[PDB]
Amino acid sequence: TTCCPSIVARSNFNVCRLPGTPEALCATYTGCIIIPGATCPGDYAN
């Protein structure tokens, strides 16, 4: 469950996963967190 509240964060987040960088690592940079559960609301689903 990846939660981020920004179109500008979410974008470079998924873009980081493209060249072969773990979204897990990139998440730690963006601030967009990847959690097991906890269904984030529609503002953290951006």
From Swiss-Prot:
Disulfide pairings: 3-40, 4-32, 16-26
Alphabetical list of PROSITE patterns matching this protein: THIONIN
Keyword presence, NADP: no
Main location: secreted
Domain of life: Eukaryota
UniProt keyword annotation of rRNA-binding present: no
GO cellular component: extracellular region
Keywords, alphabetical: Disulfide bond, Plant defense, Secreted
GO biological process, one term: defense response
Subcellular localization(s) per the UniProt record: Secreted
Entries under Pfam families matching the protein: Thionin (PF00321)
Note, other: Two isoforms exists, a major form PL (shown here) and a minor form SI.
Physiological role: The function of this hydrophobic plant seed protein is not known.
Family listed: Belongs to the plant thionin (TC 1.C.44) family.
Identification of the protein by name: Crambin
Species whose genome carries this gene: Crambe hispanica subsp. abyssinica
